[PDB]
Design a protein around this nucleic acid. Structure first.
Lengths: 194, 45, 155, 76, 174, 60
RNA sequence: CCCGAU
DNA sequence: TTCCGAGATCAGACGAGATCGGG
DNA sequence: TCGTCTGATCTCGGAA
């Protein structure tokens, strides 16, 4: 069962390694035996990560449907620690009034939301999903210039896409996609985000 | 002020002409049975 | 070796269960790959599930045709299927939509908005009788006769 | 200088397209022709001798252009 | 009907002159057409523009060069590097230019496997003279092999402005 | 028999409403270069043909 | 609208 | 007690090769 | 001829 309360912790510490934080390598890969230290207790929140950039704050609220009050439990410690980004990894989903509470408090703190079974597989290492790479601000200006393209007019990926929501991308950024082929393997495509 | 907010580009047309108080009849050169619907209007007019 | 195929739709609830390596599992419903696995996996299923059903019927085809059809179908954010409805979300010009289905609504609605369309593509340059810019009308030709920007006269 | 140095089949068609219609309006012929009365057959004699008074204006789609003489191209 | 819906969306695409494929409104669909910018029409079987086994045997038969040294495995990889970076092969993107190189070494090892069995190439003279016609690849051929595989690759590009989607709508619809 | 079906129309009657050539051989014909054959003429890339074939020699 | 051709 | 928001459940749309031939 | 997508009302449920 614990193949989750571990692989979720395995996934988000693959996730926030891809987003460019400083997770030490031994903290990244755990076998289940390294997580069997806590394995009997948590079925019958003791799981909350703070990592900083080279700072996000994940949450596993044990409530199935996270209400506004459950967000408000750590709205205050969000602004206490002066942390700017957060994650709320939920069990079932948010209550349909609570998702606005994210976008009401939009530009101050970020706090993206994931489901549990959305995160149980690392979609980056899926065979169908190619290697998205977020490009820098100067990597856009050498793109647009070479193709003589305005920022718009690039192929577009949604902001609520599962890989844009993975990599944590606001509007206006451009990902670089390395689609693998058979003759070349380096078929590179870019995508502006919506 | 509130004409562009209904997305009607007012250089093309304001909302007062979504309804018909006059009506263009098409020219005779593009109808040498729609004439019969025109005279049915002026009967009822 | 063993695998298991389902007749279902709930993809990420299948992808996340214990025992299934969710890194290697595909669908044939290109929307449930788009909702779950991003757009780029939804591009690769539209490549695959056409090239799977085309080699099944004999009927060999280049991938470069399907690599274009998929890449048109998913380049504006989400997978835009080629129906009457997907054309509205793909094209801006009216007469190209108006030459397709729903000629009544697409012409009145673009009169409600003040829709300035330029005349491009081929479904409008054929209607207007302009030489289309797709193909032989892309470039244009000059003449190579004797000319120069000359000096003027002293005034 | 960056586009393909091969004359495409859409450029050979229109260069033969308008050099036929030019020579069907009494243009000066560049090939000292040998009895061909079809103006299109004169134009392919103009192309193979590489004497066509035409410069292709190739439009990169941003709006910039790039000229190419029909002498300066590799026909098939 | 499915021919009609397909071509009423896909008609206004053409590969522009900077190899990009754009819509009528300027928006990019593909950055190169189909990854390599190659015609499916001119494309050879296996979705590859050359099928190098056929071209090399064609070159050996169109140009058999008698009175030629035909030494190999020590010169073949050396002539195929001296020719390949020689004022040319810049427009060949190096995914194709790898594919010649992995084929040339693939036929370079086929030579040494035969010369492993017999017939040392000490200077190109053994006493049975016929043995040097086992895998003859003499350097008049291998330079004509490259000047053909370049030009067959350069010719079978997508010609700019070619109604690329209109080819696609027929090739799915038919 | 091909005598009932041989047909050619150089330039003849046009329809009174839309000024295109008429439909039928009994009315001196003109056969519809349909919209499916429009895409064939698109896919060849022949641009100046389609202006000639759908504006010059049909509705000038 | 029928019929018929492909 | 309140209720503001949201998943559930009907009703209406406007599509569905191409041409040619004659009564 | 259903077949489709759309968009319009109800109701059991959580937050303040």
């Amino acid at each position: 069962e614990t193949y989750r309360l571990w692989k979720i912790r395995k996934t988000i510490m693959q996730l926030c390694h891809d987003r460019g934080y400083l997770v030490t390598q031994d903290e990244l890969d755990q076998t289940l035996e390294e997580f069997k230290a806590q394995s009997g207790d948590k079925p019958s929140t003791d799981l909350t990560v703070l990592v900083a950039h080279n700072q996000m704050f994940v949450f596993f609220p044990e409530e199935p449907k996270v209400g506004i009050k459950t967000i408000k439990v750590y709205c205050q410690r969000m602004q206490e620690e002066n942390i700017t980004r957060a994650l709320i990894v939920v069990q079932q989903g948010m209550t349909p009034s609570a998702k606005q509470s994210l976008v009401d408090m939009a530009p101050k703190y970020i706090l993206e939301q994931f489901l549990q079974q959305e995160l149980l597989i690392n979609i980056t290492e899926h065979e169908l999903v190619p290697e998205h790479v977020v490009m820098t601000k100067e990597e856009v200006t050498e793109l647009l210039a070479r193709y003589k393209l305005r920022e718009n007019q690039l192929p577009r990926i949604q902001a609520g896409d599962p890989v844009a929501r993975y990599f944590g991308i606001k509007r206006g950024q451009v990902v670089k996609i390395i689609r693998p082929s058979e003759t070349a393997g380096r078929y590179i495509t870019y995508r502006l985000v919506q | 002020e509130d004409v562009p907010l209904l997305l009607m580009n007012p250089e093309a047309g304001k909302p007062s002409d979504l309804i018909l108080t006059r009506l263009l009849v098409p020219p005779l050169c593009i109808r040498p049975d729609l004439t019969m619907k025109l005279t049915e209007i002026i009967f009822l007019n | 070796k063993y695998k298991l195929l389902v007749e279902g739709d709930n993809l990420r609830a299948v992808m996340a269960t214990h025992g299934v390596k969710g890194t290697r599992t595909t669908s044939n419903n290109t929307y449930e790959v788009e909702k779950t696995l991003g757009i780029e996996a939804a591009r690769t299923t539209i490549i695959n599930e056409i090239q799977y059903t085309m080699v099944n019927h004999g009927m060999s085809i280049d991938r470069r045709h399907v690599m274009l059809l998929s890449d048109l179908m998913t380049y504006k954010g989400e997978v835009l299927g080629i129906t009457r409805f997907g054309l509205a979300k793909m094209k801006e010009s009216v007469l190209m939509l108006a030459s397709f289905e729903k000629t009544a609504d697409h012409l009145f609605d673009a009169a409600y908005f003040g829709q300035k369309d330029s005349v491009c593509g081929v479904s409008e340059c054929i209607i207007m009788g302009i030489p289309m810019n797709i193909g032989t009308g892309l470039f244009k030709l000059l003449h190579k006769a004797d000319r120069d920007p000359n000096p003027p006269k002293r005034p | 200088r960056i586009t393909t140095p091969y004359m495409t089949k859409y450029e050979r068609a229109r260069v033969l397209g308008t050099r036929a219609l030019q020579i069907a309006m009494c243009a000066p012929v560049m090939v000292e022709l040998e009895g061909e009365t079809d103006p299109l057959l004169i134009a392919m004699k103009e192309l193979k001798a590489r004497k066509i008074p035409i410069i292709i204006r190739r439009y990169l789609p941003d709006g910039s252009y790039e000229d190419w003489g029909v002498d300066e191209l590799i026909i098939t | 009907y499915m021919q009609r819906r397909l071509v009423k969306s896909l008609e206004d695409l053409c590969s522009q002159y900077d190899l990009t494929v754009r819509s009528s409104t300027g928006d990019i669909i593909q950055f190169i057409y189909g990854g390599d910018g190659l015609d499916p029409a001119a494309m050879e079987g296996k979705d590859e523009p050359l099928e190098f086994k056929r071209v090399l045997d064609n070159i050996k038969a169109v140009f058999p060069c008698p009175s030629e040294p035909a030494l190999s495995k020590n010169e073949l990889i050396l002539t195929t590097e001296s020719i390949m970076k020689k004022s040319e092969f810049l427009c060949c993107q190096d995914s194709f230019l790898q594919e010649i190189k992995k084929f040339i070494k693939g036929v370079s090892e086929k030579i040494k496997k035969t010369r492993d069995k017999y017939g040392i190439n000490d200077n190109g003279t053994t006493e049975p003279r016929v043995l040097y016609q086992l895998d003859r690849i003499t350097p008049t051929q291998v330079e004509k092999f490259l000047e053909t595989c370049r030009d067959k690759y350069m010719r079978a590009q997508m010609e700019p402005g070619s109604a690329v989607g209109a080819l696609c709508a027929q090739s799915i619809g038919e | 028999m091909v005598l009932d079906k041989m047909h050619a129309r150089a330039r003849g009657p046009r329809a009174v409403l839309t000024r295109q050539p008429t439909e039928g051989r009994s009315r001196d014909g003109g056969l519809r270069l349909g919209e499916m054959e429009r895409d064939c003429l698109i896919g060849y890339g022949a641009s100046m043909l389609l202006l000639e074939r759908l504006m010059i020699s049909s509705d000038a």
